[PDB]
Symmetry: D2
Subunit: 461 residues, 4 copies
Amino acid sequence: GFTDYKVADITLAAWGRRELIIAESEMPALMGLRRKYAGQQPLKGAKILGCIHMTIQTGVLIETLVALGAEVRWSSCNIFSTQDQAAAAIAAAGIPVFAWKGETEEEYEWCIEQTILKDGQPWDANMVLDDGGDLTEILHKKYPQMLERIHGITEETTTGVHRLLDMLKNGTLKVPAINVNDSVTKSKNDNKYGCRHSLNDAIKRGTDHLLSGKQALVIGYGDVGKGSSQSLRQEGMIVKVAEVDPICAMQACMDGFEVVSPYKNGINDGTEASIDAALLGKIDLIVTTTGNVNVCDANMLKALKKRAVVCNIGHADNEIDTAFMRKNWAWEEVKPQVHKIHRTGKDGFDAHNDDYLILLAEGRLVNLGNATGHPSRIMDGSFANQVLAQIHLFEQKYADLPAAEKAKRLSVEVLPKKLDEEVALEMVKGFGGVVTQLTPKQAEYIGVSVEGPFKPDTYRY
Amino acid sequence: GFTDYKVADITLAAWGRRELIIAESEMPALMGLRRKYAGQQPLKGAKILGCIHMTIQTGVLIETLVALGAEVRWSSCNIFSTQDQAAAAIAAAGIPVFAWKGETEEEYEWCIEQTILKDGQPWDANMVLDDGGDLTEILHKKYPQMLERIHGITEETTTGVHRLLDMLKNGTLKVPAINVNDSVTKSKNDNKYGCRHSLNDAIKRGTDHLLSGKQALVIGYGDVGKGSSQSLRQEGMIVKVAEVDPICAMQACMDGFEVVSPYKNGINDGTEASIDAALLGKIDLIVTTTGNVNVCDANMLKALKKRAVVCNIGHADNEIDTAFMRKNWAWEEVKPQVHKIHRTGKDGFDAHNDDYLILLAEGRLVNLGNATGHPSRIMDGSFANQVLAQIHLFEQKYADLPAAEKAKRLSVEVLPKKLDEEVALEMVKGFGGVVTQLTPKQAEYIGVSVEGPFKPDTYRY
Amino acid sequence: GFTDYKVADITLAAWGRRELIIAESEMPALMGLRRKYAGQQPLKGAKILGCIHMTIQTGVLIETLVALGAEVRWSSCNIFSTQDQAAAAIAAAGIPVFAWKGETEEEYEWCIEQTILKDGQPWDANMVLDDGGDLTEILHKKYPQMLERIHGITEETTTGVHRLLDMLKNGTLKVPAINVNDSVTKSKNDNKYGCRHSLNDAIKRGTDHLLSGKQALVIGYGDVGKGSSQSLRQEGMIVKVAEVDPICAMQACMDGFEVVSPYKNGINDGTEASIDAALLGKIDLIVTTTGNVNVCDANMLKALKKRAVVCNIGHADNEIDTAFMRKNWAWEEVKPQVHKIHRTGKDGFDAHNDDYLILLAEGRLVNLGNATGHPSRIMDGSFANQVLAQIHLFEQKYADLPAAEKAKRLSVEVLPKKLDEEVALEMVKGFGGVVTQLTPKQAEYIGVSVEGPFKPDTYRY
Amino acid sequence: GFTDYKVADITLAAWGRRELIIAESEMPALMGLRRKYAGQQPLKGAKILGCIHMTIQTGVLIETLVALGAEVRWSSCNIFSTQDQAAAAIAAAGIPVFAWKGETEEEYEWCIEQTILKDGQPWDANMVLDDGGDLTEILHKKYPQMLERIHGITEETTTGVHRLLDMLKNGTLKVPAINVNDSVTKSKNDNKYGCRHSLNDAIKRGTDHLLSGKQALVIGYGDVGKGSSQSLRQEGMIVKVAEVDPICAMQACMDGFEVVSPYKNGINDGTEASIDAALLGKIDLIVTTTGNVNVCDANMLKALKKRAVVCNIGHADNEIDTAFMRKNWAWEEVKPQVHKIHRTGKDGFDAHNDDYLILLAEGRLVNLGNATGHPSRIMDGSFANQVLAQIHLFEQKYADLPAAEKAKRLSVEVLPKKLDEEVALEMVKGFGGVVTQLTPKQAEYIGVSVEGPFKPDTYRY
Ligand SMILES: NC(=O)c1ccc[n+]([C@@H]2O[C@H](COP(=O)([O-])OP(=O)(O)OC[C@H]3O[C@@H](n4cnc5c(N)ncnc54)[C@H](O)[C@@H]3O)[C@@H](O)[C@H]2O)c1
Ligand SMILES: NC(=O)c1ccc[n+]([C@@H]2O[C@H](COP(=O)([O-])OP(=O)(O)OC[C@H]3O[C@@H](n4cnc5c(N)ncnc54)[C@H](O)[C@@H]3O)[C@@H](O)[C@H]2O)c1
Ligand SMILES: NC(=O)c1ccc[n+]([C@@H]2O[C@H](COP(=O)([O-])OP(=O)(O)OC[C@H]3O[C@@H](n4cnc5c(N)ncnc54)[C@H](O)[C@@H]3O)[C@@H](O)[C@H]2O)c1
Ligand SMILES: NC(=O)c1ccc[n+]([C@@H]2O[C@H](COP(=O)([O-])OP(=O)(O)OC[C@H]3O[C@@H](n4cnc5c(N)ncnc54)[C@H](O)[C@@H]3O)[C@@H](O)[C@H]2O)c1
Ligand SMILES: Nc1ncnc2c1ncn2[C@@H]1O[C@H](CO)[C@@H](O)[C@H]1O
Ligand SMILES: [Cl-]
Ligand SMILES: [K+]
Ligand SMILES: [K+]
Ligand SMILES: [K+]
Ligand SMILES: [K+]
């Protein structure tokens, strides 16, 4: 009967299910929600448009939403991030999913449109779960009538939240959102420790390069740059860090990294003469982590050491100037999501040319494109937050509020600290960790409840 | 003919001056402010009561405040934290200071009273710089009339800020304060990296013990606990972490520590039966980092491995139950701020007894008691913030405001992010770090100024 | 019209060749030998039986031997270690190779036989290059007449060398050997840093498990155990180490590991009562590194935590008692080289059973089975030694010596320190490292030549 | 009425004894020998000339030698290494010791002469325990009749052993020696992990500098350089390494250090033009670890960054060219064993001069000069070996052998591996480590006894 899906190969379903059964055992916060809320069915009647990397971890999120009563229609938010066995297992469970590894851009857009439309007409969606804001943008621009009946958006990523806050400032956001990224059990777990796990993993899978003893430049030292720099330093790389934010740069210095700029004195004068050629001529590996544009620009790429690896773990495909490389230099596929870019010109190359760079995942998320992204026990935190955020906005029923009541609730908000702590506690117990209970005297002394929350909203962890 | 001081030994002044000249070269943010504001004299007319560890680093702070036009009267906020050469150098410069290493509690109170009183009468103070809140409490309880002429308090430490926020919530705070602690260039520099540097330093100076291969228990995993755990792990200790806050415990797990409780199932019901005797019987070193009371309690001390080291880098002398040890067990001074505590009874000890613990700094701040606290290049951040906070509150002139205007400004506030970034930039340049300048295109892409600030006020770093 | 090979898929040749061209740029010592000796053709007339993991790195070794004039016939020394693209590239270059990933044991023996036989008769072999000693053993037991014409064996691995030294002690060794393992640029490069790179790589590829915060037990702390312990600790695992050698255990303690035994008091009396069930009940990962038998025995496997991962990076398939698991417990293939072993019985399992272990590479070398083994820039050292050792024994022409002269040369020897240093220098230059030249006065002061060797033969590095 | 000593202050004895009693609890291998051999008095009649750093650790060694029946006469082998409380405690126990912190060179020679002479005439010495070979050299050159009656020398340090091997090769060594340094429980414990503990300790005590984020250059990567590099990297320094030995350089690369030379292309032709001014102009700290001469030369000192710290943890005072600095530049004592060296000229300096270096311990061993050297639990290994070596040579009674029998025993040898393992085992047990016992089957499989030794003499650990 069930045909409402499109995946690479449905015969991978049994493999996907074996990996989902393992992943459940690695996701105690998400499986804890599944057990706590099963009887109450808090997402009964929820119809969720989901756009996030169709991994095994996203599989456990989907099956938790469904176990709590939701229906979903799913796509990946990246052309290389799907695990074909995860997409097959979800299709085989009778869930609409449109995702495969190695989509074209045209197929990416088609997949999102297959979630929005059921049998050629808008689905009766009433919730959105987004990673990076592409689905959110398409609904606002192309399907405004659908947003009338949507109660909320839950957004995974730093870049997606930035796009929501821009819409809210400009008065174009039509439904409330939860900023899932800024839970501590997301931002200071997934963004940092996920990249610590998955960056060196992706570089090894793609290149099998020794990292020990080699020179890296990490562009950015936010949550992703911090985790990326550690991924590489812990392998024995000599890591230098670039930053525009002097507070983040101060953290890099204290963490034991040299803070450098690709530009002389940190100033881009619009010419190749402002590039620190001596510095870039020694770098074996550049990683972009910024959420910004052209932080590894054409003139940097021209100055890099021969056979340097270039990758992006931040956003989109334009942290590195891949457009410059597509226009000017010859691409030689080594294997999927690994290209040698020959700096000898556009029209062919010598197979034994020494003057190339290695680009991973065509300048798109390297951890998800060349490996499997973050591990289950880290994504547990992010995805437990996603479930709690879906429950919160679905129960508030914004779409059913009268105009005057909507105006008061139209916001981009974080989950309460108490929920962030309850997710953290399930993660700690998954490690076999034992938190201490405050005595009444101690709770009084520091001015908190024995139940928490334990820190004021200003606390930075 | 200057006599308005009390220090251990004025003949240490020349040594103090030599170390102050080195410290100036290690404190570019603080010396940057000294050079930028010297001509403007923004603290002309300021009369500052200062109570903070009389170290070489505090010496550079005092001489910066004086260089910007202030008069000060100074004491230490801890009986063991004074560096006698720093106190001597400050006295020799004609600045009133009442501080020596190894004060009694009675001498500590006398020293604070000597700052408050000049020639037997209240000094015409109009500013307060505090670390831990003891001076703040004495002014509110004993000298309320003096607070009528005081424009503000600048408070250094987590515990001091907690005490200010309690006064504000109870309506007993009489003057506005700046929370210096919660500048990122304080809390996420000093509290973390300071303890990283100075905890293993103090344990080595006191005991000369090998740390590698030994078992530690760090109680707390806030900023101080994070830095403390790293101090020990980086030396090759096997570190276990205790926490009441599940988010901080999650961080400890992800950072590669086992999270344990001294109590079975984390429940302290006050009985010896609740103590995890198997765990505590393997611990060679306990460090308290909490700012809470009785987190290393009598029953834990009884269960500790023979010859374990016990120390506190958080607050006061009651994180460890030192009162229990003073009443019940015999103390053998090894050398100043190092005592063997013989668990054989309160009266006689055998010089060759094997059943003892080693207590550092009598359960008071170990980094400052057994070594020299944080290094100059870290305290640069904290003390640049102190100077900016003093300038801000002095210029606001709260004490001269009409009643209606006072009411609107009576708060506990942090410095603006822009100043936090300007401190960080001077610290980065001290390392020879080069921040990148955003292009206008990049600044517009992430919605910030090329000049910063670079992050929203919610950002946690 | 070359057909003298058997590989998984000859159409993988182009991909293999792209990866060989990258590997050449990562192997400066091996490519330095290729360039230095090309003109001399020192292996002209050498006919080498090779048995070592048919990886990209082994590909560069093979083509170096051929570039120096050798003919070879090749097989893999492990049923899971072949990279099918590497085997294809070598076949497509017209080199006899019999190797694929996922051989049966019967296919493994048939592949070695295809190297020994050409067109149904013993090949006119005159050199052996071995890893683990299986080919060496087959020649001695089954083809002793072939050894009459063989000039020597060059042996890669600790276990293979141990087997050669046993043959020499028993007087059963028929040709001289070089112990390649005990070059410092092999043992203290490959064995240690190779495993550091490739152990966490293999565990991530097989399971995608988070390692940070979890408990590991590494059995052994020789070169492989040291590198393995670091692989895990650098990811944030809490690593405990087992050893029988108290000197290696001393090193583990000092390196910051707790040293534990699976057995109470370290005494394995073969009973379940001797197992430390509390210790094994907390372990998430066991790694064997010993080259010994039954160091993760049936009683340990029964006591392990549910869903623990078990793997071997040492030798054979019997460091872990895989025979006990094949007899007693049901194996569920997750994907190739990843099995769940259900401790509920032999005859099938509940798909949702929680009581299983995860076995990687069926208890055989996990780095080569679940990933790609050591990276090119590490194997450069091992394989430069292999080439120098082949040249040395081929030039000595043992098989052509009179009986009296044979007797004096029948030994298992290491390469001279001077060659070890010349390999190391090419590796250092590959990192862009610059070695200092001694002045004549300095060389005289420490009693060495400016050219080296720099250390006496007793030096341990 | 014991007066046969010279120390700084006999009233420090009680403090010394308290620290000796603690040190006993940290030295289980040395205290194990004291307990095992007490009844047998193996050193009854031994009269030992001892020249080694008069630390608390040396005190426990001395009192073990005395407890086993020896008489000794002691001096320090370094002018800054004595702990005055240790020297006092040894004098107060009625043991001849001539040692204080801050000897002149003339006092150093006088102290050694006070051990050799008792009441103005040669002591009836029959054993030597030396560190660095100065006492050994004096006996050979000045007191050859005394060597007739001496049974052996036990030598602590790499440099001392090199001097013994030179005497043996030249036929000038008069008595046999044990090379204590090359026990694995010395060289790969003390030399490496001792410096790891004590290098950052000494730099903090001397300067209180932040190390995190600053640039270091470690000259040498033998056991001392390895431990020194780790001391600094673990604190967050960015460490570069220099070497002449390409094998040691390879290890530095793999351990995650950049390998550089102070000289362009590593060629030290004695010209200023050969200095890499750009490299040295960024270095905040140079540490020499070589046992060689002029490895931090005048032209390097001229090129160093302003306010760089320079120190030596290797040997003598001429690894750094201190003689050049004494001749050309003005020394300003900060405090004992800390000098600012003003590069503005020889005579006066400006108190606020920015152009200086900081020299620790006047270029002599920094760990012992500015802190307390290695900790008790590490020196346990070195000193257990010293005691075994004294017992071995004393029992052999070389001086009582006839000329022809002396000739066969005149050697420089190491202790047998079995004793090295027995020292290691006591050290492991002191950490609470549990070694596994081999089964009979396992011991047979790897060809060792269940009792050990576990490795061949060629094994490098
Ligand atoms: N790949 C993944 O699995 C993964 C996980 C989490 C988030 N992300 C994405 O990674 C990006 C970074 O996320 P984050 O949470 O670290 O954001 P963040 O704001 O915490 O960090 C980004 C940092 O980049 C710095 N930066 C900006 N422009 C720069 C420039 N030109 N040069 C140097 N530094 C520059 C900023 O100062 C900032 O500190 C976002 O796009 C986010 O969505 C990816
Ligand atoms: N010694 C120094 O140089 C230095 C430096 C900075 C701050 N401090 C002091 O250190 C203390 C901690 O400061 P912080 O900035 O880390 O505060 P914080 O609030 O960041 O961290 C304190 C941590 O203690 C934990 N905690 C509380 N009670 C506990 C208990 N019973 N068991 C386990 N964990 C418990 C809390 O959950 C919290 O995470 C304060 O008193 C502060 O003033 C000292
Ligand atoms: N997978 C790879 O890529 C790779 C690389 C190098 C070598 N190897 C193999 O790894 C194995 C180990 O090699 P190595 O060079 O480390 O040898 P090694 O002799 O240096 O180390 C082996 C260690 O195992 C210890 N050991 C033995 N039995 C033990 C037991 N019952 N419990 C605990 N510890 C025990 C020994 O004391 C020794 O220290 C060998 O089989 C070698 O051929 C594998
Ligand atoms: N301070 C202490 O507590 C302590 C402890 C042990 C030994 N030592 C002394 O430290 C010194 C080193 O001992 P070790 O055991 O490390 O010796 P080692 O032989 O293992 O190491 C010395 C290293 O210096 C390198 N080297 C020599 N000249 C060099 C140069 N010009 N540039 C760069 N590298 C150069 C050599 O190649 C060698 O690797 C000796 O003098 C030893 O006696 C001191
Ligand atoms: N605390 C200490 N006491 C005695 N000797 C020491 C100490 N620290 C280091 N040493 C020795 O100093 C020697 C160098 O002179 C080293 O070989 C080491 O064994
Ligand atoms: Cl622009
Ligand atoms: K994953
Ligand atoms: K300090
Ligand atoms: K490989
Ligand atoms: K010491």
